[PDB]
Ligand binder design. Structure first.
Ligand code: GDP
Length: 423
C-alpha cells in the first residue's frame, strides 16, 4: 500500500453498524476483495487502485479501517453471527457497551462520553499519521447513532482539527418512526451543523417510497433498505477510492459543495437502483433520474435551486455522450440566484463500475430544497415540544427543554439561510 488519503470509518448505533455489512461488501467487491476471506478475489487487478483509502492491507489480508461502536451488542451480532463475517468485522475494531441509549439522543451522548478515551486511544495507536479524516455512518432517529454520533463528530473535529469529518447520516421515516425521532434529529442536525464538514443525508422514507411507487428493491425489511443504503453511500465514495477527473479527498469533497459554512447538508441521488432498471436504461436516463426528486435519497416534494452539485459517471460511459448530455441537462437545472451559469455543476467519469451494473450515475447536491425537508422535521418537533410531549427522558438525561429549544432555533437558522439563497 501507498501512504496517504486514509479514511477511518466510524459506524455508530445499530443502524449505522448494520449498514456496514453492504457498505463494506460493496467496497470489498469493487476492489476485488472477498469480505469472507479477507483476501483478493482474483489475481486480476487494475494497475492503480486506491483500496488503501478505506481498507488496510495486513500481511494476512485486507481489513476495514473502521471502528464499530455501539452502546448495545445487537448490531455487531448481526455482522459476526448472522452475516458470519467475524474475520472482517473483528473485535479489535469494536468499541462496545451494554447499557443502551433507549432511543434518546442525550443518553447516547452521555453514555458514549465514557467510551471516548478508549476510542481516541485506538485512533492514535492504530491509525496512520497520514490519515486524512473520518467518515461517520449513523442514523439520526435513535439515541446511540444520534447522540454518540454527535459526540464523535464533535470530539474528532476538536481533537483532529486538520482532518476532515464526513457524516453519512440517515434521517428517520417521516411517516413511520419512533415518537422521539424529531427530538433526536433536531439535536443531531444541530450538532452536525456545528462540527461536521459535510453531511450527506439519507432517508428511509425516500427508499421506501421508490419500492411503494414494480421491480422490487426491497423484499425483506431492513435487510434490503440498509442493503440499498450501504450501496449508495459506497457509490458516493467512489470519487475517494478511484482515479479520474473527480478523484477527491475529504477536504476537496466538502469544498466543492459547502459554499457558506452553514450550507453543509447534501442530498445524494443514484441511478440505477435495480438490475432490471440498469439493463433497460441509458446514460441520459440515469442523469435525468438523478435530477428527478423521486430518486433523491431525501424525500422532496419537488426540485429546489442548486447551489453546488457534483455528478459522477461510473463504468462503461462514452465520454462524448457525457459531454453532450451535461450541456442539455445544465440548461434545465434550476440553480440558486447568483450561481454563475457554468459554476454550479461538476461532472466526471470513473472507469471502475459497480458490481451489479455496467453503468452508474451518482449526484451529490447542495440544494435549497433541504429547507423544505428540514421544515417538515421542524413542524414535527414543534407538534410535540409545544405540548411538552415525550420530553421527560431528555430532561432526566442531562438535556434541558431550553437546550431542546436552542437546537431547534439554530436548526431553524439553517433553514432560513438555505431559503435566502433560494430567493
Ligand atoms: N434505513 C434504516 N434505518 C434504520 C436502520 N436501523 C435503525 N434505523 C433507523 O434508526 C432510527 C432509530 O435509531 P436506531 O439506529 O434504530 O437506534 P440507535 O441504536 O439508538 O442508533 C429509526 O428511525 C430506524 O428507522 C437501518 O438498518 N436502516
Amino acid at each position: 500500500g501507498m501512504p496517504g488519503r486514509e479514511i477511518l470509518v466510524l459506524h455508530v448505533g445499530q443502524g449505522g453498524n448494520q449498514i456496514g455489512y453492504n457498505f463494506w461488501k460493496t467496497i470489498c467487491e469493487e476492489h476485488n476483495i472477498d469480505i469472507r476471506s479477507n483476501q483478493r478475489k482474483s489475481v486480476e487487478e487494475d494497475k492503480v487502485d486506491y483500496k488503501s483509502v478505506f481498507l488496510v492491507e495486513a500481511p494476512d489480508g485486507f481489513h476495514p479501517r473502521a471502528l464499530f461502536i455501539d452502546l448495545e451488542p445487537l448490531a455487531v451480532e448481526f455482522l459476526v453471527k448472522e452475516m458470519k463475517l467475524g474475520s472482517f468485522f473483528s473485535e479489535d475494531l469494536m468499541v462496545l457497551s451494554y447499557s443502551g441509549a433507549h432511543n434518546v439522543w442525550s443518553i447516547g451522548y452521555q453514555t458514549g462520553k465514557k467510551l471516548i478515551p478508549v476510542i481516541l486511544e485506538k485512533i492514535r495507536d492504530t491509525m496512520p499519521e497520514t490519515l486524512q479524516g473520518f467518515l461517520i455512518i449513523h442514523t439520526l432517529g435513535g439515541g446511540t447513532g444520534s447522540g454518540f454520533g454527535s459526540l464523535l463528530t464533535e470530539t474528532l473535529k476538536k481533537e483532529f482539527p486538520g482532518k476532515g469529518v464526513l457524516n453519512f447520516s440517515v434521517l428517520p421515516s417521516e411517516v413511520n418512526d419512533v415518537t422521539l425521532a424529531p427530538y433526536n434529529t433536531v439535536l443531531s442536525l444541530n450538532h452536525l451543523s456545528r462540527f461536521s464538514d459535510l453531511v450527506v443525508l439519507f432517508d428511509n422514507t425516500a427508499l421506501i417510497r421508490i419500492v411503494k411507487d414494480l421491480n422490487y428493491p426491497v423484499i425483506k425489511q431492513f435487510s434490503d433498505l440498509n442493503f440499498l443504503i450501504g450501496r449508495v453511500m459506497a457509490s458516493i465514495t467512489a470519487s475517494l477510492r478511484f482515479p479520474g477527473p473527480l478523484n477527491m479527498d475529504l477536504m476537496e469533497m466538502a469544498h466543492n459543495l459547502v459554499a457558506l459554512p452553514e450550507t453543509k447538508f447534501i442530498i445524494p441521488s443514484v441511478a440505477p437502483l435495480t438490475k432490471e432498471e440498469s439493463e433497460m436504461s441509458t446514460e441520459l436516463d440515469l442523469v435525468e433520474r438523478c435530477f428527478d426528486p423521486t430518486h433523491y435519497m431525501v424525500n422532496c416534494s419537488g426540485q429546489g435551486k442548486t447551489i453546488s452539485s457534483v455528478l459522477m459517471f461510473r463504468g462503461n460511459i462514452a465520454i462524448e455522450n457525457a459531454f453532450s448530455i451535461m450541456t442539455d441537462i445544465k440548461s434545465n437545472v434550476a440553480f440558486a440566484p447568483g450561481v454563475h451559469p457554468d459554476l454550479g455543476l461538476k461532472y466526471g467519469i470513473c472507469e471502475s463500475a459497480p458490481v451489479d451494473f455496467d453503468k452508474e450515475v451518482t449526484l451529490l447536491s447542495n440544494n435549497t430544497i433541504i429547507s423544505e425537508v428540514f421544515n417538515r422535521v421542524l413542524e414535527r418537533f414543534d407538534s410535540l415540544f409545544n405540548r411538552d410531549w415525550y420530553t421527560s427522558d431528555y430532561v432526566n438525561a442531562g438535556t434541558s427543554k431550553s437546550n431542546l429549544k436552542e437546537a431547534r432555533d439554530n436548526f431553524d437558522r439553517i433553514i432560513k439561510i438555505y431559503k435566502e439563497i433560494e430567493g
